[PDB]
């Protein structure tokens, strides 16, 4: 069980072995309550099991994308901050810690993709996607390219696709309409078409993945890449002279990257919910607290307005927050399995010419809107089985059972 | 171990508790060698397990369709009948008991579908499929139908489909070419088209299954049906005065039903292979032997020429044998799973209008030729998962990996 009259906190070692602990000591000095920071292996996988039995930590620190499942299982306590504390943090950050219109965590830090550029090759990076083709033709004459980033993962390609109207699941009044999918609207098609045209006119290659793009940028072969703050320290050691800025606009509208929010959740089984609220609101989420943590390991852009104004004096942190403000918060709902599955396939097919942009995104619309996570797992399981089979496996099947038609086709490529 | 100096025989109870035993007694009377006829449950599943460890019976009686798998596992001894003994049996029966051009069993009896007709409704049954629509129009005026049989199972529909051309797997020596499938030739398409047209002009219902057909014929509601010797006794107890005759021709060519051949295999681990050969050749496969068995439970049409001529005095048995001669021996290989799956689906889709005959049989060709039993099981598993799901599940997926394209589609009908 969880012991009364103390605080046990779980956070990943990569957020700082000393920082949060120092805030803990300050809390203990004022209140006499002992704060203990632990870093157990796979704590994101451990917490849901331990907490389901009424054990585990009082507080858990993790990216908001796991907090949806925890909230669904009734493992997180509903938090009760007043409009005053809430005004101290950026309004959007609160959207990452709402589940069925209920606040279930405190937002700490904000993370998102920015345009990373090589200042020696390109002192003035382009404001628009539209002017990249021209820039690439010019750079190709010097044996360089304009832009390389991961085309294989939707996380990276979505910002362009979403610029003119694309969305995953409609977010309005603190609620996700899981039936309102925005994968095959005019805007989605316009964006993916521009991406495919970049590949057709050989400004980009559909094969380019994360590691290939990182190699290219860090060797000074490409003037720009699209990546997050996790990629900065590799560039630092590379001694490429880099800047981080706002993502290019498409059709006059900003690229909309998905936003991840490091959050602090209170265990529903914790007998110390009031101590947790006191610690998180009045010791951690202050200039003094976030400074203690940041001095240990930098948080990047933070939810707390007062301290973000300080950190944003680093223009790379300012870039991260601007791109996050203009982006969309990544849905923490089960249907994102279907979204990722659908869109990953759709962009690989559109980039390879296997499907037209229209065909690809129409299919992805259907999949994202109508495939449960278990259905995705079943379909993928079948696909793996067949694809990994060495024999000449071919299928041309159409079966209709119980008012439902299922087709399966397996054949070599053309 | 299998005991030397005596015979243990396994056969299903339904082939007679006394008949084969009687031939065993005669063998014992002449030779002094004890023959024991046993009837264990699921002996077709038991034999492969026990014989793999060098145990089980000296001789096993079963349909040849399981003898392919036994022969593959090296569980059946090569039999050594001379050309003289082989000429005593119908040539085509030998093809059912060959594996890699090696004889692995003695053929006993032959079974196949025939045209069963109600003599009071139809004293003169039709020689051709072509004349059935007109015959139905006439019988419909008297509140009756011409023909009802199981359309759900390919066992029953294939005879018409294969009439003009079409085969499951190609066979040479005792070998079936698993890549050479004959499902989507013009002959198969012409036959399935005639079946679909019967359904379209409402001479038959696409829903009609085994029990529905049996009910209809045994209640005198339909003049004809297509069925095997297993179905005869239920008609005997029914009000219906029936005959069994040759199946109708399509485009002047006989319907080609699949043939099942009850066969006698000698266990490869038997120390009594010579006693077994003596018993099977010179006691069982004789007029006297097959008589002892038949008087217990009928064998139907038999492989032995001399005794088939006697049994064929019954026109129903004559019919079974003629439709077997004109049919094709059922392949005894594991790929028949893929064949049945492909063709079951193809005929349901063609009969229901989901697919054209052409598309249905082209698809069935691909499936039968290139779906392992593993692949069929994986596909089928997914399909059940999805179809049974209450939510509004829809999929429009095309993925390509490692030079292979996979499509999956789920939508309402």
PDB file of C-alpha atoms in Angstrom, chain A residues 143-378:
ATOM      1  CA  UNK A 143      26.443  19.726 -54.219  1.00  0.00           C
ATOM      2  CA  UNK A 144      23.943  20.202 -51.299  1.00  0.00           C
ATOM      3  CA  UNK A 145      20.177  19.696 -50.663  1.00  0.00           C
ATOM      4  CA  UNK A 146      17.650  22.102 -49.019  1.00  0.00           C
ATOM      5  CA  UNK A 147      15.749  19.688 -46.727  1.00  0.00           C
ATOM      6  CA  UNK A 148      16.020  16.086 -45.395  1.00  0.00           C
ATOM      7  CA  UNK A 149      13.722  14.674 -42.675  1.00  0.00           C
ATOM      8  CA  UNK A 150      12.059  11.341 -41.765  1.00  0.00           C
ATOM      9  CA  UNK A 151       9.312  10.641 -44.397  1.00  0.00           C
ATOM     10  CA  UNK A 152       8.659   7.087 -43.032  1.00  0.00           C
ATOM     11  CA  UNK A 153       6.941   8.314 -39.781  1.00  0.00           C
ATOM     12  CA  UNK A 154       3.687  10.347 -39.804  1.00  0.00           C
ATOM     13  CA  UNK A 155       4.856  12.270 -36.622  1.00  0.00           C
ATOM     14  CA  UNK A 156       7.314  14.125 -38.950  1.00  0.00           C
ATOM     15  CA  UNK A 157       5.193  14.506 -42.180  1.00  0.00           C
ATOM     16  CA  UNK A 158       1.891  15.429 -40.409  1.00  0.00           C
ATOM     17  CA  UNK A 159       2.917  19.088 -39.686  1.00  0.00           C
ATOM     18  CA  UNK A 160       2.784  19.899 -43.481  1.00  0.00           C
ATOM     19  CA  UNK A 161      -0.300  17.716 -44.091  1.00  0.00           C
ATOM     20  CA  UNK A 162      -2.216  19.515 -41.241  1.00  0.00           C
ATOM     21  CA  UNK A 163      -1.150  23.100 -42.188  1.00  0.00           C
ATOM     22  CA  UNK A 164      -4.117  23.665 -44.601  1.00  0.00           C
ATOM     23  CA  UNK A 165      -6.863  21.795 -42.682  1.00  0.00           C
ATOM     24  CA  UNK A 166      -5.827  18.247 -41.734  1.00  0.00           C
ATOM     25  CA  UNK A 167      -6.506  16.945 -38.232  1.00  0.00           C
ATOM     26  CA  UNK A 168      -6.570  13.520 -36.549  1.00  0.00           C
ATOM     27  CA  UNK A 169      -9.592  13.725 -34.227  1.00  0.00           C
ATOM     28  CA  UNK A 170     -11.509  17.028 -33.904  1.00  0.00           C
ATOM     29  CA  UNK A 171     -10.780  18.763 -30.531  1.00  0.00           C
ATOM     30  CA  UNK A 172     -13.458  21.329 -29.431  1.00  0.00           C
ATOM     31  CA  UNK A 173     -14.529  22.540 -25.937  1.00  0.00           C
ATOM     32  CA  UNK A 174     -12.046  20.168 -24.161  1.00  0.00           C
ATOM     33  CA  UNK A 175     -13.532  17.108 -25.974  1.00  0.00           C
ATOM     34  CA  UNK A 176     -12.441  14.712 -28.808  1.00  0.00           C
ATOM     35  CA  UNK A 177     -15.150  13.789 -31.369  1.00  0.00           C
ATOM     36  CA  UNK A 178     -13.716  10.314 -32.243  1.00  0.00           C
ATOM     37  CA  UNK A 179     -16.060  10.155 -35.309  1.00  0.00           C
ATOM     38  CA  UNK A 180     -14.840  13.533 -36.709  1.00  0.00           C
ATOM     39  CA  UNK A 181     -11.575  12.488 -38.508  1.00  0.00           C
ATOM     40  CA  UNK A 182      -9.747  15.040 -40.729  1.00  0.00           C
ATOM     41  CA  UNK A 183      -7.407  12.762 -42.741  1.00  0.00           C
ATOM     42  CA  UNK A 184      -9.009  13.168 -46.229  1.00  0.00           C
ATOM     43  CA  UNK A 185     -10.204  16.845 -46.364  1.00  0.00           C
ATOM     44  CA  UNK A 186      -8.980  19.369 -49.026  1.00  0.00           C
ATOM     45  CA  UNK A 187      -6.227  20.600 -46.635  1.00  0.00           C
ATOM     46  CA  UNK A 188      -4.806  17.142 -45.910  1.00  0.00           C
ATOM     47  CA  UNK A 189      -4.757  16.389 -49.689  1.00  0.00           C
ATOM     48  CA  UNK A 190      -3.112  19.780 -50.524  1.00  0.00           C
ATOM     49  CA  UNK A 191      -0.306  19.211 -47.971  1.00  0.00           C
ATOM     50  CA  UNK A 192       0.425  15.565 -48.846  1.00  0.00           C
ATOM     51  CA  UNK A 193       0.359  16.583 -52.580  1.00  0.00           C
ATOM     52  CA  UNK A 194       3.083  19.235 -51.933  1.00  0.00           C
ATOM     53  CA  UNK A 195       5.147  16.536 -50.076  1.00  0.00           C
ATOM     54  CA  UNK A 196       4.680  14.026 -52.946  1.00  0.00           C
ATOM     55  CA  UNK A 197       5.590  16.785 -55.520  1.00  0.00           C
ATOM     56  CA  UNK A 198       8.808  17.442 -53.497  1.00  0.00           C
ATOM     57  CA  UNK A 199       9.600  13.717 -54.013  1.00  0.00           C
ATOM     58  CA  UNK A 200       8.517  13.738 -57.731  1.00  0.00           C
ATOM     59  CA  UNK A 201      10.703  16.831 -58.581  1.00  0.00           C
ATOM     60  CA  UNK A 202      13.572  15.043 -56.673  1.00  0.00           C
ATOM     61  CA  UNK A 203      13.940  17.727 -53.937  1.00  0.00           C
ATOM     62  CA  UNK A 204      13.371  14.822 -51.551  1.00  0.00           C
ATOM     63  CA  UNK A 205      13.527  10.991 -51.670  1.00  0.00           C
ATOM     64  CA  UNK A 206      10.745   8.787 -50.224  1.00  0.00           C
ATOM     65  CA  UNK A 207      13.460   6.501 -48.749  1.00  0.00           C
ATOM     66  CA  UNK A 208      14.830   9.257 -46.428  1.00  0.00           C
ATOM     67  CA  UNK A 209      14.309   8.111 -42.787  1.00  0.00           C
ATOM     68  CA  UNK A 210      15.285   9.508 -39.334  1.00  0.00           C
ATOM     69  CA  UNK A 211      18.953   8.291 -39.180  1.00  0.00           C
ATOM     70  CA  UNK A 212      19.608   9.180 -42.878  1.00  0.00           C
ATOM     71  CA  UNK A 213      18.313  12.762 -42.281  1.00  0.00           C
ATOM     72  CA  UNK A 214      20.334  13.115 -39.000  1.00  0.00           C
ATOM     73  CA  UNK A 215      23.544  11.901 -40.763  1.00  0.00           C
ATOM     74  CA  UNK A 216      22.930  14.331 -43.707  1.00  0.00           C
ATOM     75  CA  UNK A 217      22.311  17.442 -41.533  1.00  0.00           C
ATOM     76  CA  UNK A 218      25.142  16.652 -39.042  1.00  0.00           C
ATOM     77  CA  UNK A 219      27.624  16.168 -41.969  1.00  0.00           C
ATOM     78  CA  UNK A 220      26.633  19.550 -43.547  1.00  0.00           C
ATOM     79  CA  UNK A 221      25.156  17.806 -46.670  1.00  0.00           C
ATOM     80  CA  UNK A 222      21.673  19.384 -46.212  1.00  0.00           C
ATOM     81  CA  UNK A 223      20.820  22.965 -45.191  1.00  0.00           C
ATOM     82  CA  UNK A 224      17.730  22.011 -43.091  1.00  0.00           C
ATOM     83  CA  UNK A 225      15.964  19.196 -41.222  1.00  0.00           C
ATOM     84  CA  UNK A 226      12.770  18.864 -39.106  1.00  0.00           C
ATOM     85  CA  UNK A 227      13.391  17.412 -35.649  1.00  0.00           C
ATOM     86  CA  UNK A 228      12.777  17.876 -31.883  1.00  0.00           C
ATOM     87  CA  UNK A 229      14.942  19.061 -28.931  1.00  0.00           C
ATOM     88  CA  UNK A 230      16.112  15.396 -28.318  1.00  0.00           C
ATOM     89  CA  UNK A 231      18.248  15.801 -31.504  1.00  0.00           C
ATOM     90  CA  UNK A 232      20.096  19.038 -30.405  1.00  0.00           C
ATOM     91  CA  UNK A 233      23.082  17.515 -28.456  1.00  0.00           C
ATOM     92  CA  UNK A 234      24.139  15.341 -31.488  1.00  0.00           C
ATOM     93  CA  UNK A 235      24.321  18.561 -33.592  1.00  0.00           C
ATOM     94  CA  UNK A 236      26.240  20.347 -30.727  1.00  0.00           C
ATOM     95  CA  UNK A 237      29.021  17.666 -30.862  1.00  0.00           C
ATOM     96  CA  UNK A 238      28.929  17.744 -34.743  1.00  0.00           C
ATOM     97  CA  UNK A 239      30.012  21.496 -34.668  1.00  0.00           C
ATOM     98  CA  UNK A 240      27.632  22.233 -37.589  1.00  0.00           C
ATOM     99  CA  UNK A 241      26.616  25.819 -36.764  1.00  0.00           C
ATOM    100  CA  UNK A 242      22.807  25.443 -36.419  1.00  0.00           C
ATOM    101  CA  UNK A 243      19.745  27.571 -35.580  1.00  0.00           C
ATOM    102  CA  UNK A 244      16.209  26.440 -34.562  1.00  0.00           C
ATOM    103  CA  UNK A 245      13.239  28.456 -35.907  1.00  0.00           C
ATOM    104  CA  UNK A 246       9.475  28.425 -36.711  1.00  0.00           C
ATOM    105  CA  UNK A 247       8.412  25.678 -39.180  1.00  0.00           C
ATOM    106  CA  UNK A 248       7.702  26.873 -42.735  1.00  0.00           C
ATOM    107  CA  UNK A 249       4.106  27.948 -43.570  1.00  0.00           C
ATOM    108  CA  UNK A 250       2.074  26.144 -46.251  1.00  0.00           C
ATOM    109  CA  UNK A 251      -0.554  28.159 -48.184  1.00  0.00           C
ATOM    110  CA  UNK A 252       0.139  31.059 -45.733  1.00  0.00           C
ATOM    111  CA  UNK A 253      -0.764  28.850 -42.684  1.00  0.00           C
ATOM    112  CA  UNK A 254       1.687  27.495 -40.053  1.00  0.00           C
ATOM    113  CA  UNK A 255       2.803  23.814 -40.052  1.00  0.00           C
ATOM    114  CA  UNK A 256       1.003  22.111 -37.113  1.00  0.00           C
ATOM    115  CA  UNK A 257       3.356  19.678 -35.291  1.00  0.00           C
ATOM    116  CA  UNK A 258       1.965  17.332 -32.591  1.00  0.00           C
ATOM    117  CA  UNK A 259       2.845  18.473 -29.030  1.00  0.00           C
ATOM    118  CA  UNK A 260       4.032  16.252 -26.138  1.00  0.00           C
ATOM    119  CA  UNK A 261       3.547  17.557 -22.558  1.00  0.00           C
ATOM    120  CA  UNK A 262       5.548  16.101 -19.651  1.00  0.00           C
ATOM    121  CA  UNK A 263       2.877  15.891 -16.888  1.00  0.00           C
ATOM    122  CA  UNK A 264       2.632  15.122 -13.125  1.00  0.00           C
ATOM    123  CA  UNK A 265      -0.298  12.771 -12.253  1.00  0.00           C
ATOM    124  CA  UNK A 266      -1.566  12.058  -8.702  1.00  0.00           C
ATOM    125  CA  UNK A 267      -2.222   8.338  -7.954  1.00  0.00           C
ATOM    126  CA  UNK A 268      -6.003   7.741  -7.349  1.00  0.00           C
ATOM    127  CA  UNK A 269      -4.947   5.324  -4.527  1.00  0.00           C
ATOM    128  CA  UNK A 270      -2.620   7.936  -2.847  1.00  0.00           C
ATOM    129  CA  UNK A 271      -3.662   8.929   0.698  1.00  0.00           C
ATOM    130  CA  UNK A 272      -1.573  12.168   0.201  1.00  0.00           C
ATOM    131  CA  UNK A 273      -3.556  13.978  -2.601  1.00  0.00           C
ATOM    132  CA  UNK A 274      -3.492  17.290  -0.654  1.00  0.00           C
ATOM    133  CA  UNK A 275       0.302  17.097   0.032  1.00  0.00           C
ATOM    134  CA  UNK A 276       0.792  16.232  -3.699  1.00  0.00           C
ATOM    135  CA  UNK A 277      -1.325  19.289  -4.757  1.00  0.00           C
ATOM    136  CA  UNK A 278       0.676  21.530  -2.349  1.00  0.00           C
ATOM    137  CA  UNK A 279       4.085  20.225  -3.608  1.00  0.00           C
ATOM    138  CA  UNK A 280       3.173  20.414  -7.352  1.00  0.00           C
ATOM    139  CA  UNK A 281       1.343  23.816  -7.274  1.00  0.00           C
ATOM    140  CA  UNK A 282       3.456  25.861  -4.780  1.00  0.00           C
ATOM    141  CA  UNK A 283       6.984  24.277  -4.809  1.00  0.00           C
ATOM    142  CA  UNK A 284       7.567  22.647  -8.310  1.00  0.00           C
ATOM    143  CA  UNK A 285       5.385  24.821 -10.661  1.00  0.00           C
ATOM    144  CA  UNK A 286       7.146  28.073  -9.600  1.00  0.00           C
ATOM    145  CA  UNK A 287      10.174  29.985 -11.002  1.00  0.00           C
ATOM    146  CA  UNK A 288      12.183  28.727  -7.967  1.00  0.00           C
ATOM    147  CA  UNK A 289      11.139  25.054  -8.429  1.00  0.00           C
ATOM    148  CA  UNK A 290      11.484  24.733 -12.252  1.00  0.00           C
ATOM    149  CA  UNK A 291      14.920  26.472 -11.914  1.00  0.00           C
ATOM    150  CA  UNK A 292      16.104  23.756  -9.419  1.00  0.00           C
ATOM    151  CA  UNK A 293      15.064  21.037 -11.956  1.00  0.00           C
ATOM    152  CA  UNK A 294      16.352  22.945 -15.041  1.00  0.00           C
ATOM    153  CA  UNK A 295      19.855  23.512 -13.482  1.00  0.00           C
ATOM    154  CA  UNK A 296      20.120  19.660 -13.295  1.00  0.00           C
ATOM    155  CA  UNK A 297      18.640  18.765 -16.755  1.00  0.00           C
ATOM    156  CA  UNK A 298      17.056  21.396 -19.047  1.00  0.00           C
ATOM    157  CA  UNK A 299      13.231  20.906 -19.453  1.00  0.00           C
ATOM    158  CA  UNK A 300      13.105  22.852 -22.743  1.00  0.00           C
ATOM    159  CA  UNK A 301       9.874  24.872 -23.116  1.00  0.00           C
ATOM    160  CA  UNK A 302       7.764  24.782 -19.893  1.00  0.00           C
ATOM    161  CA  UNK A 303       4.029  25.194 -19.237  1.00  0.00           C
ATOM    162  CA  UNK A 304       4.634  27.858 -16.522  1.00  0.00           C
ATOM    163  CA  UNK A 305       4.411  31.258 -18.279  1.00  0.00           C
ATOM    164  CA  UNK A 306       6.666  33.202 -15.813  1.00  0.00           C
ATOM    165  CA  UNK A 307       9.690  30.822 -16.277  1.00  0.00           C
ATOM    166  CA  UNK A 308       9.069  30.130 -20.025  1.00  0.00           C
ATOM    167  CA  UNK A 309       9.565  33.935 -20.572  1.00  0.00           C
ATOM    168  CA  UNK A 310      13.034  33.406 -18.952  1.00  0.00           C
ATOM    169  CA  UNK A 311      13.956  30.164 -20.844  1.00  0.00           C
ATOM    170  CA  UNK A 312      12.692  31.603 -24.241  1.00  0.00           C
ATOM    171  CA  UNK A 313      15.744  33.941 -24.147  1.00  0.00           C
ATOM    172  CA  UNK A 314      17.248  30.758 -25.723  1.00  0.00           C
ATOM    173  CA  UNK A 315      15.831  31.212 -29.272  1.00  0.00           C
ATOM    174  CA  UNK A 316      15.673  27.377 -29.770  1.00  0.00           C
ATOM    175  CA  UNK A 317      13.298  27.119 -26.735  1.00  0.00           C
ATOM    176  CA  UNK A 318      11.316  30.094 -28.129  1.00  0.00           C
ATOM    177  CA  UNK A 319      11.085  28.191 -31.471  1.00  0.00           C
ATOM    178  CA  UNK A 320       9.916  24.962 -29.713  1.00  0.00           C
ATOM    179  CA  UNK A 321       7.081  26.847 -27.895  1.00  0.00           C
ATOM    180  CA  UNK A 322       5.987  28.857 -30.971  1.00  0.00           C
ATOM    181  CA  UNK A 323       5.759  25.628 -33.055  1.00  0.00           C
ATOM    182  CA  UNK A 324       3.891  23.950 -30.100  1.00  0.00           C
ATOM    183  CA  UNK A 325       1.407  26.919 -29.661  1.00  0.00           C
ATOM    184  CA  UNK A 326       0.680  26.720 -33.473  1.00  0.00           C
ATOM    185  CA  UNK A 327       0.649  22.865 -33.402  1.00  0.00           C
ATOM    186  CA  UNK A 328      -1.991  20.474 -32.055  1.00  0.00           C
ATOM    187  CA  UNK A 329      -1.765  18.584 -28.745  1.00  0.00           C
ATOM    188  CA  UNK A 330      -1.296  14.866 -29.509  1.00  0.00           C
ATOM    189  CA  UNK A 331      -4.537  13.011 -28.676  1.00  0.00           C
ATOM    190  CA  UNK A 332      -4.073  10.623 -25.672  1.00  0.00           C
ATOM    191  CA  UNK A 333      -7.078   8.469 -26.793  1.00  0.00           C
ATOM    192  CA  UNK A 334      -7.038   4.783 -27.902  1.00  0.00           C
ATOM    193  CA  UNK A 335      -8.029   5.645 -31.531  1.00  0.00           C
ATOM    194  CA  UNK A 336      -4.537   7.138 -32.235  1.00  0.00           C
ATOM    195  CA  UNK A 337      -3.350   3.491 -32.882  1.00  0.00           C
ATOM    196  CA  UNK A 338      -5.647   3.513 -35.942  1.00  0.00           C
ATOM    197  CA  UNK A 339      -4.537   7.077 -36.866  1.00  0.00           C
ATOM    198  CA  UNK A 340      -0.790   6.219 -36.874  1.00  0.00           C
ATOM    199  CA  UNK A 341      -1.391   2.863 -38.670  1.00  0.00           C
ATOM    200  CA  UNK A 342      -3.623   4.452 -41.384  1.00  0.00           C
ATOM    201  CA  UNK A 343      -1.437   7.543 -42.050  1.00  0.00           C
ATOM    202  CA  UNK A 344       1.957   5.703 -41.918  1.00  0.00           C
ATOM    203  CA  UNK A 345       0.734   3.368 -44.722  1.00  0.00           C
ATOM    204  CA  UNK A 346      -1.008   6.234 -46.631  1.00  0.00           C
ATOM    205  CA  UNK A 347       2.105   8.508 -46.847  1.00  0.00           C
ATOM    206  CA  UNK A 348       4.471   5.590 -47.766  1.00  0.00           C
ATOM    207  CA  UNK A 349       1.990   4.593 -50.568  1.00  0.00           C
ATOM    208  CA  UNK A 350       1.539   8.231 -51.793  1.00  0.00           C
ATOM    209  CA  UNK A 351       5.345   8.855 -51.705  1.00  0.00           C
ATOM    210  CA  UNK A 352       6.018   5.519 -53.588  1.00  0.00           C
ATOM    211  CA  UNK A 353       3.171   6.053 -56.182  1.00  0.00           C
ATOM    212  CA  UNK A 354       1.381   2.789 -55.085  1.00  0.00           C
ATOM    213  CA  UNK A 355      -1.661   5.090 -54.433  1.00  0.00           C
ATOM    214  CA  UNK A 356      -2.648   8.621 -55.521  1.00  0.00           C
ATOM    215  CA  UNK A 357      -2.814  11.168 -52.653  1.00  0.00           C
ATOM    216  CA  UNK A 358      -6.658  10.992 -52.965  1.00  0.00           C
ATOM    217  CA  UNK A 359      -6.815   7.136 -52.794  1.00  0.00           C
ATOM    218  CA  UNK A 360      -4.238   6.946 -49.959  1.00  0.00           C
ATOM    219  CA  UNK A 361      -5.928   9.537 -47.655  1.00  0.00           C
ATOM    220  CA  UNK A 362      -9.529   8.279 -48.406  1.00  0.00           C
ATOM    221  CA  UNK A 363      -8.387   4.798 -47.204  1.00  0.00           C
ATOM    222  CA  UNK A 364      -6.602   6.385 -44.177  1.00  0.00           C
ATOM    223  CA  UNK A 365      -9.838   8.315 -43.314  1.00  0.00           C
ATOM    224  CA  UNK A 366     -11.815   5.031 -43.241  1.00  0.00           C
ATOM    225  CA  UNK A 367      -9.094   3.199 -41.192  1.00  0.00           C
ATOM    226  CA  UNK A 368      -8.580   6.005 -38.591  1.00  0.00           C
ATOM    227  CA  UNK A 369     -12.387   6.413 -38.081  1.00  0.00           C
ATOM    228  CA  UNK A 370     -13.416   2.673 -37.962  1.00  0.00           C
ATOM    229  CA  UNK A 371     -10.470   0.505 -36.750  1.00  0.00           C
ATOM    230  CA  UNK A 372     -10.322  -0.299 -33.017  1.00  0.00           C
ATOM    231  CA  UNK A 373      -6.761  -0.887 -31.622  1.00  0.00           C
ATOM    232  CA  UNK A 374      -7.620  -4.665 -31.471  1.00  0.00           C
ATOM    233  CA  UNK A 375      -8.714  -4.604 -35.189  1.00  0.00           C
ATOM    234  CA  UNK A 376      -5.357  -2.875 -36.115  1.00  0.00           C
ATOM    235  CA  UNK A 377      -3.516  -5.617 -34.124  1.00  0.00           C
ATOM    236  CA  UNK A 378      -5.513  -8.433 -35.900  1.00  0.00           C
TER     237      UNK A 378
END
